[PDB]
């Protein structure tokens, strides 16, 4: 029922590629939204009274009353937009909802006929009031923006699911039940971003722990699996705002994002920075503060499956053999086990768990034991904490560039630290050939093991680097 690691690896890759494209689409669309030609037309849709409602006066005794006025404005805008958008189309096909691996594979075959959508046509559409719900909302953001309110465009990116390993992977009303696009609006009085879905759910919410927009129910999550919710702002910001809309971000959603391993996170942040064309504002901080609060109000999940590979939390039973409880800590919570009577588990904070390694294991991380170290745990093998240890500084090479080697005539380099200070690592199949030809002093580098040493190159004095590299470059003439 299950596919090859090749297909797995392809699906993960295609997922990243498809995502990056989607997020770029957001960026470009949000540009088209900021259009001045559009603004000038859209402003006159909004009465001055409504405009005044959208920019209430600072109220010192009760800012709430100002927020309240802003909310009233946003509702009047949603209504007059209901009237402006006359002809509301159907998506040609599945729109930007998630597609199944099968559908993708099969999309190669039939080259479905697609009317291209140029930039003019978008503006013209928004001005006529003719388009699908995605365009409709996008226009709505244009409108608010033309009124000089700070109004983000939100996009729930649905790349194909890269956690679906399956070979065989198996109507309209259930897909459109929740939106792909919507709007946020910044309340300077209450210092929070307000959520606005003027077309699908036609509501306005100040999200605390629950959002009307986050899809619920098996049917809605088939075509909409909420993982990457991106906010684009007037100033060509790009911020991952998923945490607002995902009630369980740290358990459920983390398993389904590329961000679950560390490589993923690094990749995702690279993409957001590529897409984030402004510099940090104070609002960014008000938001990040909200997100931290949310991340601290999520808490312990209600099931064992959601505590596998949880970022903050671990069951006493999932503590690895090589971990210990940090002295004077204890459970931060308990987990009632659904489906076993009376069965209870001790839940620890991962921040209270220490990782221990044996001497060799540390050496493979380039570390040796500090003076007067005690072991923290035993198995015949004593394990030690990271603070029991110290960098390994290998002896410097001589003037002639001799490297002190081991019994097998190599030097072990499993970490940059283990390159001597006056020496460098040169990794190259012929680096050994080179050094032998120049008859300069060097030493083979063991950089890792196969299960047998992997010799990936040479460790030579830095003064000799240029020379080796020349010999490497001229290896054909040796």
């Amino acid at each position: 029922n299950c596919s090859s690691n090749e297909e797995r690896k392809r699906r993960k890759y295609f997922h990243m590629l498809y995502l990056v494209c989607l997020m770029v689409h957001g960026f470009i669309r949000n540009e088209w939204i900021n259009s001045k030609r559009l603004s000038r037309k859209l402003s006159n849709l909004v009465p001055e009274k409504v405009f005044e409602l959208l920019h209430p006066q600072k109220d010192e005794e009760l800012p709430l009353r100002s927020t309240r006025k802003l909310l009233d404005g946003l509702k009047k805008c949603m209504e007059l937009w209901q009237k402006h958008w006359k002809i509301t189309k159907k998506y040609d096909n599945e729109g930007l909802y998630m597609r199944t691996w099968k559908e993708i594979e099969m999309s190669a075959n039939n080259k479905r006929k697609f009317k291209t959508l140029k930039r003019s046509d978008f503006l013209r559409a928004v001005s006529k009031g003719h388009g699908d719900p995605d365009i409709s909302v996008q226009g709505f953001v244009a409108m608010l923006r033309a009124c000089n309110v700070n109004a983000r465009l939100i996009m729930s990116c649905q790349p194909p699911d890269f956690t679906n390993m399956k070979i065989d992977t198996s109507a309209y009303k259930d897909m459109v039940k929740y939106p792909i696009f919507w709007c946020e609006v910044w309340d300077k009085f209450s210092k929070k971003w307000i959520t606005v879905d003027p077309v699908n759910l036609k509501t306005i919410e100040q999200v605390r722990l629950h959002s009307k927009l986050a899809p619920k129910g098996v049917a809605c999550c088939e075509r909409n699996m909420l993982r990457y919710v991106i906010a684009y702002d007037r100033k060509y910001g790009c911020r991952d705002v998923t945490r607002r809309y995902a009630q369980w971000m740290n358990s459920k959603v983390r398993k389904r994002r590329i961000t679950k391993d560390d490589f993923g996170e690094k990749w995702f942040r690279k993409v957001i920075t590529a897409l984030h064309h402004r510099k940090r504002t104070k609002i960014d901080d008000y938001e990040d503060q909200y997100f931290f609060q949310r991340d601290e109000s999520e808490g312990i999940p209600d099931s064992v499956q959601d505590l596998k590979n949880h970022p903050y939390y671990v069951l006493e039973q999932d503590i690895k053999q090589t971990q210990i409880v940090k002295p004077g800590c204890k459970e931060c919570g308990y987990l009632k086990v659904h489906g076993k009577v009376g069965k209870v588990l001790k839940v620890y904070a991962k921040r209270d768990i220490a990782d221990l390694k044996s001497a060799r294991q540390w050496y493979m991380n380039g570390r040796i034991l500090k003076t007067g170290s005690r072991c923290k745990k035993v198995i015949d093998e004593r394990l030690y904490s990271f603070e029991d240890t110290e960098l390994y500084i290998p002896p410097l090479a001589s003037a002639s560039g001799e490297i002190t080697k081991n019994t097998f005539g190599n030097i072990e380099v499993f970490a940059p630290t283990m390159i001597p200070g006056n020496c460098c690592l040169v990794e190259n199949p012929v680096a050994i050939k080179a050094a032998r030809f120049l008859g300069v002093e060097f030493a083979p580098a063991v950089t890792s093991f196969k299960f047998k040493p992997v010799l990936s190159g040479i460790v030579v004095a830095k003064w000799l680097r240029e020379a080796i590299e020349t010999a490497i470059d001229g290896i054909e003439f040796i």
Partner: protein, 54 residues
């Protein structure tokens, strides 16, 4: 990276105005540029910037 002007054209245009049609284009283009894969894994921000210069 190393792409034509006909593929970067189809990709800027699909990505910008017809993302519904992403699916078949990407199947194709990724099949003509093996290195694109490892590029996207190593250097996504590059692929972005490429798609932005418009």
């Amino acid at each position: 990276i190393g792409l034509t002007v006909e593929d970067l054209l189809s990709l800027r245009q699909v990505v910008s105005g017809n993302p519904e049609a992403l699916a078949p284009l990407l199947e194709n283009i990724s099949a003509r540029y093996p290195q694109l894969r490892e590029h996207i894994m190593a250097n996504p921000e590059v692929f972005v910037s490429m798609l932005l210069e418009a």
